[PDB]
Amino acid sequence: KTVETVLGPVPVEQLGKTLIHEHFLFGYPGFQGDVTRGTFREDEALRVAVEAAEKMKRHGIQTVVDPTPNDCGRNPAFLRRVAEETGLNIICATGYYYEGEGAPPYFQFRRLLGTAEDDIYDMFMAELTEGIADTGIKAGVIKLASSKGRITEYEKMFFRAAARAQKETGAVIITHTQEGTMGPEQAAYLLEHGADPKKIVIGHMCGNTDPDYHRKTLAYGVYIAFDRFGIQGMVGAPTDEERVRTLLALLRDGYEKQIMLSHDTVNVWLGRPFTLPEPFAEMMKNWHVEHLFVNIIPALKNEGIRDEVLEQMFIGNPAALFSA
Amino acid sequence: KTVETVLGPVPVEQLGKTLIHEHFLFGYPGFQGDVTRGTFREDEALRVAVEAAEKMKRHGIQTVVDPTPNDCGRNPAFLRRVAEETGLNIICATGYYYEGEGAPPYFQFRRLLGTAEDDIYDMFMAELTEGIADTGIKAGVIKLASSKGRITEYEKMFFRAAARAQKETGAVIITHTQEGTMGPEQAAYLLEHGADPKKIVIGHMCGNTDPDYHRKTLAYGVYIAFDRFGIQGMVGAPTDEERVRTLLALLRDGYEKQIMLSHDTVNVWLGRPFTLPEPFAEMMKNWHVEHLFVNIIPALKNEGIRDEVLEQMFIGNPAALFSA
Ligand SMILES: [Co+2]
Ligand SMILES: [Co+2]
Ligand SMILES: [Co+2]
Numbered sequence: 001k002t003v004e005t006v007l008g009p010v011p012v013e014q015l016g017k018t019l020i021h022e023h024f025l026f027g028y029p030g031f032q033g034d035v036t037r038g039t040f041r042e043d044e045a046l047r048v049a050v051e052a053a054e055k056m057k058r059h060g061i062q063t064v065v066d067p068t069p070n071d072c073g074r075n076p077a078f079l080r081r082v083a084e085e086t087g088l089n090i091i092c093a094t095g096y097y098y099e100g101e102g103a104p105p106y107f108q109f110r111r112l113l114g115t116a117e118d119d120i121y122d123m124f125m126a127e128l129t130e131g132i133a134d135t136g137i138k139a140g141v142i143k144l145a146s147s148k149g150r151i152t153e154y155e156k157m158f159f160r161a162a163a164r165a166q167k168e169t170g171a172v173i174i175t176h177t178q179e180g181t182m183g184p185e186q187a188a189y190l191l192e193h194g195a196d197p198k199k200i201v202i203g204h205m206c207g208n209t210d211p212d213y214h215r216k217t218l219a220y221g222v223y224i225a226f227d228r229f230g231i232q233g234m235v236g237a238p239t240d241e242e243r244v245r246t247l248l249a250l251l252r253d254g255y256e257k258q259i260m261l262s263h264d265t266v267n268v269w270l271g272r273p274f275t276l277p278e279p280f281a282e283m284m285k286n287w288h289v290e291h292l293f294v295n296i297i298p299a300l301k302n303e304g305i306r307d308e309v310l311e312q313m314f315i316g317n318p319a320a321l322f323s324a
Numbered sequence: 325k326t327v328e329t330v331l332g333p334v335p336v337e338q339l340g341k342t343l344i345h346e347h348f349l350f351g352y353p354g355f356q357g358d359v360t361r362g363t364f365r366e367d368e369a370l371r372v373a374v375e376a377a378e379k380m381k382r383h384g385i386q387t388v389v390d391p392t393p394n395d396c397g398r399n400p401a402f403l404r405r406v407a408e409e410t411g412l413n414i415i416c417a418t419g420y421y422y423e424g425e426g427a428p429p430y431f432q433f434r435r436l437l438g439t440a441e442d443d444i445y446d447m448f449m450a451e452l453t454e455g456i457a458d459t460g461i462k463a464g465v466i467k468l469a470s471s472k473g474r475i476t477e478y479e480k481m482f483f484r485a486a487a488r489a490q491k492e493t494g495a496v497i498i499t500h501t502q503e504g505t506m507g508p509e510q511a512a513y514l515l516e517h518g519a520d521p522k523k524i525v526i527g528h529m530c531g532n533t534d535p536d537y538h539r540k541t542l543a544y545g546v547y548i549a550f551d552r553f554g555i556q557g558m559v560g561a562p563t564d565e566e567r568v569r570t571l572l573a574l575l576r577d578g579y580e581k582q583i584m585l586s587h588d589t590v591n592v593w594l595g596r597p598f599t600l601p602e603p604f605a606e607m608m609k610n611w612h613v614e615h616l617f618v619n620i621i622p623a624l625k626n627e628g629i630r631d632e633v634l635e636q637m638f639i640g641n642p643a644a645l646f647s648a
């Protein structure tokens with residue numbers, strides 16, 4: 001009936017139009033060490049955050065799930081400030097990034113002491129039911145991620161703990177797949193440990209452009225997300241054209257009730273500011289929160305997708321997802 | 325004649341008896357993500373920190389070099405407070421940990437933008453001559469680290485950036501070698517890039533029992549450091565007896581002006597508290613800051629090492645390294 005947000009519990013019946021995967025703040029593990037030259041300009045970040053939030057509300061968005069990992073600059077207190085100033089419902093997460101590019105030394109160590117999984121589970125429980133640090137803010141989703149072509153042994157501890165925290169709380173699990181791989185695998189592993197398919201969102205599915213891969217994942221009964229619209233070139237990612245084609249093939253097969261969309265934007269980059277080289281800066285031109293509403297959805301309508309299906313993805317699916 | 329401490333420039337000839345490598349605080353990359361169950365406890369951490377500084381004091385230590393990497397919990401301000409309640413001179417560093425136990429994603433990204441090396445140099449330069457964050461405290465040494473059996477491309481970035489900064493500033497470079505490898509390699513790589521050998525210290529040299537390996541490293545004219553006394557248990561990694569036996573050989577061959585000692589203790593672990601399995605635990609029972617003065621030095625004296633060589637290592641060498 002309710003889900004935890006940065007401002008406290010909110011009736012699931014009130015989430016409304018939802019972007020399932022966006023980042024107000026984000027930093028690659030290691031930015032913390034570049035504090036001297038890559039300081040966090042609080043007020044400016046919030047200005048940028050707030051504008052982004054306002055651009056979403058301008059298109060009907062009422063809720064955003066910001067799944068920024070514990071080791072990537074998660075900052076509930078800052079999210080709360082954005083929520084207080086915009087009225088936007090913001091749901092944060094608990095979880096670590098994938099091994100390829102996260103901060104694994106800490107828990108790899110506890111793995112030697114043979115307590116990692118229990119410690120992780122203890123962490124998920126605490127952030128899901130008591131609060132994150134001394135902020136009083138609880139996380140609404142468990143964030144998981146796997147590497148390219150494999151779910152490492154390090155990542156499996158997080159998956160097992162996730163399934164266990166989910167059995168206990170009925171918390172939603174959101175995942176990150178790397179370069180269109182491991183979708184079916186993530187679902188199988190999570191289900192094999194008792195996780196509830198109706199509470200799982202396998203992310204970055206748009207990373208694979210072969211519908212049989214999607215169908216193979218959809219068969220486990222989970223939700224999947226085409227959440228990187230706008231990201232082009234970088235990460236051997238596909239194109240928005242390919243994304244649409246794949247999405248169209250699924251919508252026509254009748255999978256609308258298992259599909260969600262988002263951009264996966266990074267509104268304020270943590271650490272030192274950088275600028276992307278000419279070639280890529282161009283292909284990423286549409287990587288912003290208004291992209292789905294200004295370019296993608298109009299495109300889907302010309303292709304015959306009707307309003308009822310769009311509402312199912314942006315309002316109905318999130319509603320079902322967050323309610324047992 | 326002066327060196328930067330967490331309390332500003334101090335005169336080199338006033339450093340006195342020194343421990344070249346100790347950590348008041350340390351946390352493995354990822355500790356930050358476990359903030360909820362592993363919150364930092366100021367008051368208490370400060371109690372252990374100072375108590376540790378007081379025990380060192382009992383034995384004549386007036387100066388400690390705390391090279392905690394930027395991504396491993398370095399906290400100049402905290403160090404600053406320990407110095408105030410003890411008077412003890414504390415020199416901190418600027419640098420990142422090696423690939424395996426560090427937070428590589430952040431600078432791996434800049435690397436793709438062909439800017440890592442130059443950014444790292446910018447960071448070193450900034451922390452050695454202006455201040456760390458808004459602490460006003462300048463680092464007094466650059467910390468470098470390489471992995472087992474090799475200096476990866478990620479690590480060579482910091483080495484190059486480090487040689488470049490040593491030239492322009494005359495700053496000391498202190499290193500970490502993993503499992504007794506790469507000492508001669510690191511020294512060669514740094515010298516072959518302009519660094520000054522009398523301003524370098526190859527660390528964890530006590531990691532290799534073969535005295536020849538040391539002769540190789542010492543032949544470059546650099547200082548080496550047996551800085552892990554007390555650490556035994558990696559089952560295959562050096563015991564103190566082997567360390568002593570190796571120290572004795574090199575001192576007897578006349579290499580006293582190039583050697584320094586320490587424990588590499590971690591006084592306050594960052595993240596959630598833990599406990600070593602009883603076999604290892606009882607085997608690391610001498611890993612504290614008094615081990616050198618209560619066991620090692622007495623044992624070296626019982627083997628014929630004269631008071632004047634001990635002073636050369638503890639006072640004369642640190643004075644020469646930093647006097648430049
Ligand atoms: Co992701
Ligand atoms: Co994301
Ligand atoms: Co070390």
Ligand SMILES: [Co+2]
Nearest residue numbers: 345347391588
């Ligand atoms: Co160390």
